PDB file of C-alpha atoms and ligand atoms in Angstrom:
ATOM      1  CA  UNK C  11     112.841 280.475  72.196  1.00  0.00           C
ATOM      2  CA  UNK C  12     110.838 282.220  69.580  1.00  0.00           C
ATOM      3  CA  UNK C  13     110.610 281.138  65.626  1.00  0.00           C
ATOM      4  CA  UNK C  14     112.697 282.717  63.993  1.00  0.00           C
ATOM      5  CA  UNK C  15     111.223 284.881  60.764  1.00  0.00           C
ATOM      6  CA  UNK C  16     114.520 285.620  58.477  1.00  0.00           C
ATOM      7  CA  UNK C  17     112.111 288.624  56.956  1.00  0.00           C
ATOM      8  CA  UNK C  18     112.767 291.207  59.716  1.00  0.00           C
ATOM      9  CA  UNK C  19     115.436 289.069  62.033  1.00  0.00           C
ATOM     10  CA  UNK C  20     118.325 291.595  63.023  1.00  0.00           C
ATOM     11  CA  UNK C  21     121.512 290.392  64.074  1.00  0.00           C
ATOM     12  CA  UNK C  22     121.294 291.270  68.318  1.00  0.00           C
ATOM     13  CA  UNK C  23     125.205 292.407  68.247  1.00  0.00           C
ATOM     14  CA  UNK C  24     124.556 295.550  65.154  1.00  0.00           C
ATOM     15  CA  UNK C  25     123.067 297.195  67.963  1.00  0.00           C
ATOM     16  CA  UNK C  26     124.614 299.628  70.371  1.00  0.00           C
ATOM     17  CA  UNK C  27     121.823 301.236  72.818  1.00  0.00           C
ATOM     18  CA  UNK C  28     122.485 304.386  74.138  1.00  0.00           C
ATOM     19  CA  UNK C  29     120.060 306.662  75.917  1.00  0.00           C
ATOM     20  CA  UNK C  30     116.385 305.622  77.071  1.00  0.00           C
ATOM     21  CA  UNK C  31     113.049 307.950  75.514  1.00  0.00           C
ATOM     22  CA  UNK C  32     110.692 306.490  78.631  1.00  0.00           C
ATOM     23  CA  UNK C  33     108.280 303.893  79.205  1.00  0.00           C
ATOM     24  CA  UNK C  34     105.174 302.887  78.350  1.00  0.00           C
ATOM     25  CA  UNK C  35     102.809 300.274  80.586  1.00  0.00           C
ATOM     26  CA  UNK C  36     104.086 297.047  79.216  1.00  0.00           C
ATOM     27  CA  UNK C  37     108.562 297.904  77.513  1.00  0.00           C
ATOM     28  CA  UNK C  38     110.208 300.788  77.685  1.00  0.00           C
ATOM     29  CA  UNK C  39     112.423 303.137  74.265  1.00  0.00           C
ATOM     30  CA  UNK C  40     115.975 302.790  74.074  1.00  0.00           C
ATOM     31  CA  UNK C  41     117.720 304.832  71.721  1.00  0.00           C
ATOM     32  CA  UNK C  42     119.945 303.333  69.774  1.00  0.00           C
ATOM     33  CA  UNK C  43     123.080 302.695  66.533  1.00  0.00           C
ATOM     34  CA  UNK C  44     121.704 299.931  63.815  1.00  0.00           C
ATOM     35  CA  UNK C  45     124.633 298.911  61.697  1.00  0.00           C
ATOM     36  CA  UNK C  46     124.061 297.026  58.718  1.00  0.00           C
ATOM     37  CA  UNK C  47     120.159 297.458  59.157  1.00  0.00           C
ATOM     38  CA  UNK C  48     120.709 298.363  55.274  1.00  0.00           C
ATOM     39  CA  UNK C  49     121.838 294.977  53.905  1.00  0.00           C
ATOM     40  CA  UNK C  50     123.601 296.935  51.090  1.00  0.00           C
ATOM     41  CA  UNK C  51     126.048 298.567  53.556  1.00  0.00           C
ATOM     42  CA  UNK C  52     126.791 295.875  56.431  1.00  0.00           C
ATOM     43  CA  UNK C  53     129.051 299.083  58.028  1.00  0.00           C
ATOM     44  CA  UNK C  54     126.578 301.650  57.374  1.00  0.00           C
ATOM     45  CA  UNK C  55     125.542 303.748  60.862  1.00  0.00           C
ATOM     46  CA  UNK C  56     121.828 304.206  61.727  1.00  0.00           C
ATOM     47  CA  UNK C  57     120.232 306.140  64.166  1.00  0.00           C
ATOM     48  CA  UNK C  58     116.624 303.636  65.354  1.00  0.00           C
ATOM     49  CA  UNK C  59     114.111 303.053  68.690  1.00  0.00           C
ATOM     50  CA  UNK C  60     114.570 300.396  70.209  1.00  0.00           C
ATOM     51  CA  UNK C  61     111.133 298.562  72.245  1.00  0.00           C
ATOM     52  CA  UNK C  62     112.289 295.788  75.214  1.00  0.00           C
ATOM     53  CA  UNK C  63     110.965 294.542  78.410  1.00  0.00           C
ATOM     54  CA  UNK C  64     111.462 295.576  81.555  1.00  0.00           C
ATOM     55  CA  UNK C  65     112.979 294.103  84.262  1.00  0.00           C
ATOM     56  CA  UNK C  66     109.852 293.243  85.819  1.00  0.00           C
ATOM     57  CA  UNK C  67     108.217 291.356  82.557  1.00  0.00           C
ATOM     58  CA  UNK C  68     105.338 289.082  83.026  1.00  0.00           C
ATOM     59  CA  UNK C  69     103.928 286.733  80.967  1.00  0.00           C
ATOM     60  CA  UNK C  70     101.869 289.161  79.568  1.00  0.00           C
ATOM     61  CA  UNK C  71     104.136 292.041  79.083  1.00  0.00           C
ATOM     62  CA  UNK C  72     106.128 289.659  76.646  1.00  0.00           C
ATOM     63  CA  UNK C  73     102.369 288.702  75.197  1.00  0.00           C
ATOM     64  CA  UNK C  74     102.096 292.490  74.502  1.00  0.00           C
ATOM     65  CA  UNK C  75     105.238 292.907  72.586  1.00  0.00           C
ATOM     66  CA  UNK C  76     105.441 290.130  70.703  1.00  0.00           C
ATOM     67  CA  UNK C  77     101.592 291.138  69.810  1.00  0.00           C
ATOM     68  CA  UNK C  78     101.792 294.110  69.036  1.00  0.00           C
ATOM     69  CA  UNK C  79     105.434 293.194  66.867  1.00  0.00           C
ATOM     70  CA  UNK C  80     103.070 291.002  64.766  1.00  0.00           C
ATOM     71  CA  UNK C  81     101.060 293.928  63.526  1.00  0.00           C
ATOM     72  CA  UNK C  82     104.264 295.871  63.422  1.00  0.00           C
ATOM     73  CA  UNK C  83     104.922 292.780  60.206  1.00  0.00           C
ATOM     74  CA  UNK C  84     101.210 293.359  59.211  1.00  0.00           C
ATOM     75  CA  UNK C  85      99.996 297.353  58.357  1.00  0.00           C
ATOM     76  CA  UNK C  86     103.252 297.788  56.598  1.00  0.00           C
ATOM     77  CA  UNK C  87     104.955 301.127  55.406  1.00  0.00           C
ATOM     78  CA  UNK C  88     104.261 305.090  55.339  1.00  0.00           C
ATOM     79  CA  UNK C  89     105.609 307.817  56.478  1.00  0.00           C
ATOM     80  CA  UNK C  90     103.337 309.163  58.620  1.00  0.00           C
ATOM     81  CA  UNK C  91     103.623 306.446  60.705  1.00  0.00           C
ATOM     82  CA  UNK C  92     106.461 304.227  63.312  1.00  0.00           C
ATOM     83  CA  UNK C  93     107.741 301.550  61.475  1.00  0.00           C
ATOM     84  CA  UNK C  94     109.186 299.155  61.719  1.00  0.00           C
ATOM     85  CA  UNK C  95     112.809 298.236  61.294  1.00  0.00           C
ATOM     86  CA  UNK C  96     113.612 294.798  62.153  1.00  0.00           C
ATOM     87  CA  UNK C  97     113.671 292.634  65.078  1.00  0.00           C
ATOM     88  CA  UNK C  98     115.782 290.346  67.739  1.00  0.00           C
ATOM     89  CA  UNK C  99     113.825 287.666  68.987  1.00  0.00           C
ATOM     90  CA  UNK C 100     116.982 284.721  68.446  1.00  0.00           C
ATOM     91  CA  UNK C 101     119.482 284.051  71.649  1.00  0.00           C
ATOM     92  CA  UNK C 102     118.749 287.201  73.976  1.00  0.00           C
ATOM     93  CA  UNK C 103     115.818 288.958  75.613  1.00  0.00           C
ATOM     94  CA  UNK C 104     113.165 290.710  72.513  1.00  0.00           C
ATOM     95  CA  UNK C 105     113.920 293.636  70.858  1.00  0.00           C
ATOM     96  CA  UNK C 106     111.166 295.291  68.334  1.00  0.00           C
ATOM     97  CA  UNK C 107     113.120 298.089  66.276  1.00  0.00           C
ATOM     98  CA  UNK C 108     111.957 301.118  64.851  1.00  0.00           C
ATOM     99  CA  UNK C 109     112.306 304.454  63.260  1.00  0.00           C
ATOM    100  CA  UNK C 110     113.498 307.218  66.019  1.00  0.00           C
ATOM    101  CA  UNK C 111     112.151 310.722  66.403  1.00  0.00           C
ATOM    102  CA  UNK C 112     114.533 312.940  66.640  1.00  0.00           C
ATOM    103  CA  UNK C 113     112.468 315.840  68.263  1.00  0.00           C
ATOM    104  CA  UNK C 114     110.356 314.127  70.593  1.00  0.00           C
ATOM    105  CA  UNK C 115     106.641 313.935  70.143  1.00  0.00           C
ATOM    106  CA  UNK C 116     104.174 316.194  69.007  1.00  0.00           C
ATOM    107  CA  UNK C 117     103.179 317.825  72.660  1.00  0.00           C
ATOM    108  CA  UNK C 118     106.482 318.866  73.683  1.00  0.00           C
ATOM    109  CA  UNK C 119     107.121 319.643  70.142  1.00  0.00           C
ATOM    110  CA  UNK C 120     104.457 322.348  70.362  1.00  0.00           C
ATOM    111  CA  UNK C 121     105.422 323.824  73.603  1.00  0.00           C
ATOM    112  CA  UNK C 122     109.092 324.460  73.121  1.00  0.00           C
ATOM    113  CA  UNK C 123     108.001 326.012  70.194  1.00  0.00           C
ATOM    114  CA  UNK C 124     105.698 328.782  71.357  1.00  0.00           C
ATOM    115  CA  UNK C 125     106.052 331.897  69.962  1.00  0.00           C
ATOM    116  CA  UNK C 126     108.008 335.275  72.061  1.00  0.00           C
ATOM    117  CA  UNK C 127     105.605 336.688  74.947  1.00  0.00           C
ATOM    118  CA  UNK C 128     105.107 340.404  76.054  1.00  0.00           C
ATOM    119  CA  UNK C 129     108.429 340.495  78.303  1.00  0.00           C
ATOM    120  CA  UNK C 130     111.118 339.421  75.743  1.00  0.00           C
ATOM    121  CA  UNK C 131     113.647 342.017  74.631  1.00  0.00           C
ATOM    122  CA  UNK C 132     112.930 343.621  71.008  1.00  0.00           C
ATOM    123  CA  UNK C 133     115.588 341.800  69.715  1.00  0.00           C
ATOM    124  CA  UNK C 134     116.473 341.600  66.073  1.00  0.00           C
ATOM    125  CA  UNK C 135     114.227 341.756  62.961  1.00  0.00           C
ATOM    126  CA  UNK C 136     112.519 339.049  64.172  1.00  0.00           C
ATOM    127  CA  UNK C 137     112.419 338.557  68.197  1.00  0.00           C
ATOM    128  CA  UNK C 138     108.002 339.036  67.385  1.00  0.00           C
ATOM    129  CA  UNK C 139     108.622 336.009  65.767  1.00  0.00           C
ATOM    130  CA  UNK C 140     108.778 332.505  66.571  1.00  0.00           C
ATOM    131  CA  UNK C 141     108.989 329.220  65.230  1.00  0.00           C
ATOM    132  CA  UNK C 142     105.605 327.750  64.813  1.00  0.00           C
ATOM    133  CA  UNK C 143     103.353 329.646  61.652  1.00  0.00           C
ATOM    134  CA  UNK C 144      99.993 328.580  60.874  1.00  0.00           C
ATOM    135  CA  UNK C 145     100.992 326.457  57.489  1.00  0.00           C
ATOM    136  CA  UNK C 146     103.199 324.418  59.580  1.00  0.00           C
ATOM    137  CA  UNK C 147     100.952 323.439  62.614  1.00  0.00           C
ATOM    138  CA  UNK C 148      97.829 323.077  59.331  1.00  0.00           C
ATOM    139  CA  UNK C 149     100.586 320.771  58.016  1.00  0.00           C
ATOM    140  CA  UNK C 150     101.115 318.520  61.414  1.00  0.00           C
ATOM    141  CA  UNK C 151      97.553 317.683  61.656  1.00  0.00           C
ATOM    142  CA  UNK C 152      97.743 316.811  57.272  1.00  0.00           C
ATOM    143  CA  UNK C 153      99.801 314.089  58.112  1.00  0.00           C
ATOM    144  CA  UNK C 154      98.845 312.805  61.069  1.00  0.00           C
ATOM    145  CA  UNK C 155      95.204 312.267  59.432  1.00  0.00           C
ATOM    146  CA  UNK C 156      97.067 311.168  56.277  1.00  0.00           C
ATOM    147  CA  UNK C 157      98.524 308.019  58.975  1.00  0.00           C
ATOM    148  CA  UNK C 158      95.511 307.312  60.722  1.00  0.00           C
ATOM    149  CA  UNK C 159      93.570 307.202  57.468  1.00  0.00           C
ATOM    150  CA  UNK C 160      97.002 304.499  56.386  1.00  0.00           C
ATOM    151  CA  UNK C 161      95.942 302.548  59.397  1.00  0.00           C
ATOM    152  CA  UNK C 162      92.664 302.862  59.179  1.00  0.00           C
ATOM    153  CA  UNK C 163      92.738 301.259  55.474  1.00  0.00           C
ATOM    154  CA  UNK C 164      94.835 298.822  57.610  1.00  0.00           C
ATOM    155  CA  UNK C 165      92.148 297.900  60.087  1.00  0.00           C
ATOM    156  CA  UNK C 166      94.241 299.485  62.857  1.00  0.00           C
ATOM    157  CA  UNK C 167      92.470 301.135  65.445  1.00  0.00           C
ATOM    158  CA  UNK C 168      94.879 302.839  67.979  1.00  0.00           C
ATOM    159  CA  UNK C 169      92.598 303.388  70.683  1.00  0.00           C
ATOM    160  CA  UNK C 170      95.049 306.339  72.638  1.00  0.00           C
ATOM    161  CA  UNK C 171      95.548 309.068  69.836  1.00  0.00           C
ATOM    162  CA  UNK C 172      96.249 312.331  70.689  1.00  0.00           C
ATOM    163  CA  UNK C 173      99.772 314.505  70.434  1.00  0.00           C
ATOM    164  CA  UNK C 174     101.859 312.387  73.039  1.00  0.00           C
ATOM    165  CA  UNK C 175     101.435 309.539  70.216  1.00  0.00           C
ATOM    166  CA  UNK C 176     102.771 311.444  67.656  1.00  0.00           C
ATOM    167  CA  UNK C 177     106.457 312.044  67.226  1.00  0.00           C
ATOM    168  CA  UNK C 178     108.034 314.445  64.854  1.00  0.00           C
ATOM    169  CA  UNK C 179     111.631 314.165  62.891  1.00  0.00           C
ATOM    170  CA  UNK C 180     114.477 315.504  62.206  1.00  0.00           C
ATOM    171  CA  UNK C 181     111.887 317.327  58.781  1.00  0.00           C
ATOM    172  CA  UNK C 182     109.078 317.842  60.936  1.00  0.00           C
ATOM    173  CA  UNK C 183     107.547 315.366  59.362  1.00  0.00           C
ATOM    174  CA  UNK C 184     104.370 313.500  61.954  1.00  0.00           C
ATOM    175  CA  UNK C 185     104.965 309.695  62.553  1.00  0.00           C
ATOM    176  CA  UNK C 186     101.858 308.020  64.801  1.00  0.00           C
ATOM    177  CA  UNK C 187     103.382 306.016  67.649  1.00  0.00           C
ATOM    178  CA  UNK C 188     102.246 303.003  69.308  1.00  0.00           C
ATOM    179  CA  UNK C 189      99.387 302.258  66.836  1.00  0.00           C
ATOM    180  CA  UNK C 190      98.725 298.810  67.101  1.00  0.00           C
ATOM    181  CA  UNK C 191      99.263 297.542  71.148  1.00  0.00           C
ATOM    182  CA  UNK C 192      96.846 296.063  73.346  1.00  0.00           C
ATOM    183  CA  UNK C 193      96.046 298.960  75.854  1.00  0.00           C
ATOM    184  CA  UNK C 194      93.658 296.630  78.234  1.00  0.00           C
ATOM    185  CA  UNK C 195      90.056 298.041  77.007  1.00  0.00           C
ATOM    186  CA  UNK C 196      88.080 296.666  80.282  1.00  0.00           C
ATOM    187  CA  UNK C 197      89.855 298.017  82.278  1.00  0.00           C
ATOM    188  CA  UNK C 198      90.510 301.918  82.119  1.00  0.00           C
ATOM    189  CA  UNK C 199      91.477 303.913  85.424  1.00  0.00           C
ATOM    190  CA  UNK C 200      89.415 306.739  84.133  1.00  0.00           C
ATOM    191  CA  UNK C 201      90.875 309.164  86.811  1.00  0.00           C
ATOM    192  CA  UNK C 202      94.436 307.705  86.480  1.00  0.00           C
ATOM    193  CA  UNK C 203      96.660 310.851  85.511  1.00  0.00           C
ATOM    194  CA  UNK C 204     100.131 310.096  84.290  1.00  0.00           C
ATOM    195  CA  UNK C 205     103.891 311.281  84.940  1.00  0.00           C
ATOM    196  CA  UNK C 206     103.897 314.581  83.121  1.00  0.00           C
ATOM    197  CA  UNK C 207      99.937 315.218  84.259  1.00  0.00           C
ATOM    198  CA  UNK C 208      98.021 313.793  81.531  1.00  0.00           C
ATOM    199  CA  UNK C 209      94.686 313.154  82.089  1.00  0.00           C
ATOM    200  CA  UNK C 210      94.052 310.263  78.963  1.00  0.00           C
ATOM    201  CA  UNK C 211      90.150 309.971  79.218  1.00  0.00           C
ATOM    202  CA  UNK C 212      90.292 313.198  77.581  1.00  0.00           C
ATOM    203  CA  UNK C 213      90.957 311.630  74.425  1.00  0.00           C
ATOM    204  CA  UNK C 214      88.220 309.466  74.498  1.00  0.00           C
ATOM    205  CA  UNK C 215      85.175 309.713  72.455  1.00  0.00           C
ATOM    206  CA  UNK C 216      81.767 308.778  74.037  1.00  0.00           C
ATOM    207  CA  UNK C 217      80.853 305.042  72.422  1.00  0.00           C
ATOM    208  CA  UNK C 218      84.293 304.354  74.288  1.00  0.00           C
ATOM    209  CA  UNK C 219      84.409 306.181  77.480  1.00  0.00           C
ATOM    210  CA  UNK C 220      80.441 304.949  78.010  1.00  0.00           C
ATOM    211  CA  UNK C 221      80.061 301.758  75.815  1.00  0.00           C
ATOM    212  CA  UNK C 222      83.957 300.656  75.375  1.00  0.00           C
ATOM    213  CA  UNK C 223      82.728 300.855  72.077  1.00  0.00           C
ATOM    214  CA  UNK C 224      85.648 301.640  69.365  1.00  0.00           C
ATOM    215  CA  UNK C 225      85.583 302.534  65.667  1.00  0.00           C
ATOM    216  CA  UNK C 226      87.809 303.959  63.167  1.00  0.00           C
ATOM    217  CA  UNK C 227      85.749 306.838  63.932  1.00  0.00           C
ATOM    218  CA  UNK C 228      86.018 306.953  67.693  1.00  0.00           C
ATOM    219  CA  UNK C 229      89.752 307.126  67.315  1.00  0.00           C
ATOM    220  CA  UNK C 230      87.751 310.380  64.598  1.00  0.00           C
ATOM    221  CA  UNK C 231      87.344 311.174  68.097  1.00  0.00           C
ATOM    222  CA  UNK C 232      90.928 311.711  68.949  1.00  0.00           C
ATOM    223  CA  UNK C 233      91.699 313.499  65.800  1.00  0.00           C
ATOM    224  CA  UNK C 234      89.534 316.508  67.264  1.00  0.00           C
ATOM    225  CA  UNK C 235      90.492 316.332  70.476  1.00  0.00           C
ATOM    226  CA  UNK C 236      94.264 316.883  68.767  1.00  0.00           C
ATOM    227  CA  UNK C 237      93.594 319.082  66.473  1.00  0.00           C
ATOM    228  CA  UNK C 238      92.900 320.565  69.756  1.00  0.00           C
ATOM    229  CA  UNK C 239      96.173 320.464  70.881  1.00  0.00           C
ATOM    230  CA  UNK C 240      97.987 321.710  67.991  1.00  0.00           C
ATOM    231  CA  UNK C 241      96.885 324.987  68.038  1.00  0.00           C
ATOM    232  CA  UNK C 242      96.845 325.747  71.176  1.00  0.00           C
ATOM    233  CA  UNK C 243     100.560 324.656  70.864  1.00  0.00           C
ATOM    234  CA  UNK C 244     100.451 321.807  73.119  1.00  0.00           C
ATOM    235  CA  UNK C 245      97.743 322.605  75.499  1.00  0.00           C
ATOM    236  CA  UNK C 246      96.144 319.809  77.474  1.00  0.00           C
ATOM    237  CA  UNK C 247      92.378 319.435  77.121  1.00  0.00           C
ATOM    238  CA  UNK C 248      89.162 320.435  78.841  1.00  0.00           C
ATOM    239  CA  UNK C 249      91.079 322.752  80.653  1.00  0.00           C
ATOM    240  CA  UNK C 250      90.930 322.829  84.923  1.00  0.00           C
ATOM    241  CA  UNK C 251      88.205 320.266  84.828  1.00  0.00           C
ATOM    242  CA  UNK C 252      88.663 317.428  86.494  1.00  0.00           C
ATOM    243  CA  UNK C 253      87.507 313.824  85.759  1.00  0.00           C
ATOM    244  CA  UNK C 254      84.701 313.902  87.527  1.00  0.00           C
ATOM    245  CA  UNK C 255      83.474 316.841  86.079  1.00  0.00           C
ATOM    246  CA  UNK C 256      83.852 315.915  82.846  1.00  0.00           C
ATOM    247  CA  UNK C 257      81.769 312.495  83.318  1.00  0.00           C
ATOM    248  CA  UNK C 258      78.468 314.707  84.204  1.00  0.00           C
ATOM    249  CA  UNK C 259      80.156 318.161  80.480  1.00  0.00           C
ATOM    250  CA  UNK C 260      79.594 315.244  78.119  1.00  0.00           C
ATOM    251  CA  UNK C 261      77.225 313.532  78.891  1.00  0.00           C
ATOM    252  CA  UNK C 262      75.129 317.206  79.068  1.00  0.00           C
ATOM    253  CA  UNK C 263      76.947 317.504  74.964  1.00  0.00           C
ATOM    254  CA  UNK C 264      79.550 319.952  76.681  1.00  0.00           C
ATOM    255  CA  UNK C 265      82.724 320.691  73.800  1.00  0.00           C
ATOM    256  CA  UNK C 266      85.712 322.730  73.823  1.00  0.00           C
ATOM    257  CA  UNK C 267      86.306 326.013  73.269  1.00  0.00           C
ATOM    258  CA  UNK C 268      87.219 327.095  70.410  1.00  0.00           C
ATOM    259  CA  UNK C 269      91.218 328.375  71.505  1.00  0.00           C
ATOM    260  CA  UNK C 270      92.743 331.784  71.104  1.00  0.00           C
ATOM    261  CA  UNK C 271      93.874 332.365  67.177  1.00  0.00           C
ATOM    262  CA  UNK C 272      92.327 329.610  65.658  1.00  0.00           C
ATOM    263  CA  UNK C 273      90.646 330.561  62.281  1.00  0.00           C
ATOM    264  CA  UNK C 274      86.652 329.135  61.994  1.00  0.00           C
ATOM    265  CA  UNK C 275      87.242 326.871  59.336  1.00  0.00           C
ATOM    266  CA  UNK C 276      89.547 324.102  61.846  1.00  0.00           C
ATOM    267  CA  UNK C 277      87.793 325.013  65.027  1.00  0.00           C
ATOM    268  CA  UNK C 278      84.137 323.358  62.117  1.00  0.00           C
ATOM    269  CA  UNK C 279      86.880 320.337  61.699  1.00  0.00           C
ATOM    270  CA  UNK C 280      86.715 319.824  65.288  1.00  0.00           C
ATOM    271  CA  UNK C 281      83.742 320.315  66.229  1.00  0.00           C
ATOM    272  CA  UNK C 282      82.806 317.983  63.326  1.00  0.00           C
ATOM    273  CA  UNK C 283      84.849 315.194  64.821  1.00  0.00           C
ATOM    274  CA  UNK C 284      82.942 315.913  68.494  1.00  0.00           C
ATOM    275  CA  UNK C 285      79.818 314.595  66.901  1.00  0.00           C
ATOM    276  CA  UNK C 286      77.484 313.044  69.049  1.00  0.00           C
ATOM    277  CA  UNK C 287      76.734 310.088  66.201  1.00  0.00           C
ATOM    278  CA  UNK C 288      79.811 308.509  65.009  1.00  0.00           C
ATOM    279  CA  UNK C 289      78.816 308.794  61.061  1.00  0.00           C
ATOM    280  CA  UNK C 290      78.605 312.471  61.717  1.00  0.00           C
ATOM    281  CA  UNK C 291      81.880 312.614  62.369  1.00  0.00           C
ATOM    282  CA  UNK C 292      84.356 313.085  59.021  1.00  0.00           C
ATOM    283  CA  UNK C 293      86.088 309.667  57.619  1.00  0.00           C
ATOM    284  CA  UNK C 294      90.025 310.408  57.859  1.00  0.00           C
ATOM    285  CA  UNK C 295      89.592 310.854  54.182  1.00  0.00           C
ATOM    286  CA  UNK C 296      87.364 313.105  54.010  1.00  0.00           C
ATOM    287  CA  UNK C 297      89.778 314.861  57.022  1.00  0.00           C
ATOM    288  CA  UNK C 298      92.719 314.586  54.555  1.00  0.00           C
ATOM    289  CA  UNK C 299      90.796 316.273  51.784  1.00  0.00           C
ATOM    290  CA  UNK C 300      89.852 319.074  53.647  1.00  0.00           C
ATOM    291  CA  UNK C 301      92.736 319.162  55.328  1.00  0.00           C
ATOM    292  CA  UNK C 302      94.531 319.218  51.974  1.00  0.00           C
ATOM    293  CA  UNK C 303      92.947 322.576  50.558  1.00  0.00           C
ATOM    294  CA  UNK C 304      93.359 324.311  53.728  1.00  0.00           C
ATOM    295  CA  UNK C 305      97.010 323.959  53.906  1.00  0.00           C
ATOM    296  CA  UNK C 306      97.339 324.268  50.052  1.00  0.00           C
ATOM    297  CA  UNK C 307      95.059 327.737  50.468  1.00  0.00           C
ATOM    298  CA  UNK C 308      97.905 328.793  52.320  1.00  0.00           C
ATOM    299  CA  UNK C 309     101.260 327.311  50.416  1.00  0.00           C
ATOM    300  CA  UNK C 310     101.665 330.509  48.038  1.00  0.00           C
TER     301      UNK C 310
HETATM  302  C1  LIG P   1     116.003 308.892  67.523  1.00  0.00           C
HETATM  303  O1  LIG P   1     116.764 310.268  66.337  1.00  0.00           O
HETATM  304  C2  LIG P   1     115.553 309.921  68.343  1.00  0.00           C
HETATM  305  C3  LIG P   1     116.657 310.748  68.954  1.00  0.00           C
HETATM  306  C4  LIG P   1     116.611 312.044  69.925  1.00  0.00           C
HETATM  307  C5  LIG P   1     114.735 311.198  70.552  1.00  0.00           C
HETATM  308  C6  LIG P   1     114.287 310.781  70.285  1.00  0.00           C
HETATM  309  N1  LIG P   1     114.446 310.211  69.224  1.00  0.00           N
HETATM  310  C7  LIG P   1     113.291 310.607  70.969  1.00  0.00           C
HETATM  311  C8  LIG P   1     112.288 310.030  71.475  1.00  0.00           C
HETATM  312  O2  LIG P   1     111.664 310.299  71.382  1.00  0.00           O
HETATM  313  N2  LIG P   1     112.369 309.160  70.151  1.00  0.00           N
HETATM  314  C9  LIG P   1     111.362 307.699  69.961  1.00  0.00           C
HETATM  315  C10 LIG P   1     110.480 307.702  70.462  1.00  0.00           C
HETATM  316  C11 LIG P   1     109.628 306.898  70.422  1.00  0.00           C
HETATM  317  N3  LIG P   1     108.367 305.916  71.828  1.00  0.00           N
HETATM  318  C12 LIG P   1     108.394 307.103  72.263  1.00  0.00           C
HETATM  319  C13 LIG P   1     106.877 306.826  72.931  1.00  0.00           C
HETATM  320  O3  LIG P   1     106.017 307.912  72.131  1.00  0.00           O
HETATM  321  C14 LIG P   1     104.615 307.776  71.524  1.00  0.00           C
HETATM  322  C15 LIG P   1     109.537 305.941  69.247  1.00  0.00           C
HETATM  323  C16 LIG P   1     109.028 305.284  69.045  1.00  0.00           C
HETATM  324  N4  LIG P   1     107.957 303.996  68.699  1.00  0.00           N
HETATM  325  C17 LIG P   1     110.714 306.342  68.562  1.00  0.00           C
HETATM  326  N5  LIG P   1     111.561 307.460  68.412  1.00  0.00           N
HETATM  327  C18 LIG P   1     113.138 312.469  71.868  1.00  0.00           C
HETATM  328  N6  LIG P   1     115.310 312.241  71.567  1.00  0.00           N
HETATM  329  C19 LIG P   1     115.725 313.440  72.190  1.00  0.00           C
HETATM  330  C20 LIG P   1     114.292 314.133  72.377  1.00  0.00           C
HETATM  331  C21 LIG P   1     114.705 316.046  71.647  1.00  0.00           C
END
């Protein structure tokens, strides 16, 4: 039914759908095996993620997914985003084929890799040493900023940027996901709590929350929250603060405290991303350069 785009069109029979990876407001994501995604090797197997409508698919749900697909085609390719690989639009359900991140989202990645606690018995030379180190945490922050810098250059606003919308690959490469979606910004339930207990409003910039205004600088605010998430190793922002309290606190200029085991450099960056005036927040280009200096300094 949709027009044929031979640039991106991929034979659906070359896909073998596997285990589902999650759901969203519109559409779901399924792990899949692809054969000949590289046209030079028609029988080569590769692991991809497939986006597709649910069974309750409205015309709006289809429109949103179709819209996302077209955004995917225009943004282009970058190392730190979820890239479009192909689409299935002919003779069958709509498939949007993208890259697959084997290690899940950034939030769960960090939470599963929190350091050993005080109960754990000393067994071996490294039982006090956890999977995560400071330079790697900075590297994660750096890669997200580079990805956002790319998206910004392509005039793309994320509008949700969070650790849950950042995906981790086999080689611990950060990849920004779901950046080109229609997120229904004129009708957000600010009290909405997701199934994993997330309050998405805790990532909204003031001008986005109060004035419904979204810019790249509003994404910078969200990046600041994302920084806090990283150095809390998957912690939820504004700890133990209900949405009603968040409203008045934000109006009073309240900001999150400096998390434990976090150098003043990065909390400084967090506070810069949380400046009231969007023009006094660092650009993503400035964030990349700033995070690079810190990363180089710890990369002996
Ligand atoms: C693919 O190799 C793969 C294998 C195991 C995976 C896995 N992916 C994922 C996963 O989350 N994959 C994934 C998910 C999404 N979207 C979910 C929404 O995130 C914002 C996308 C996209 N777009 C790409 N890849 C999890 N697991 C197993 C958990 C360890």
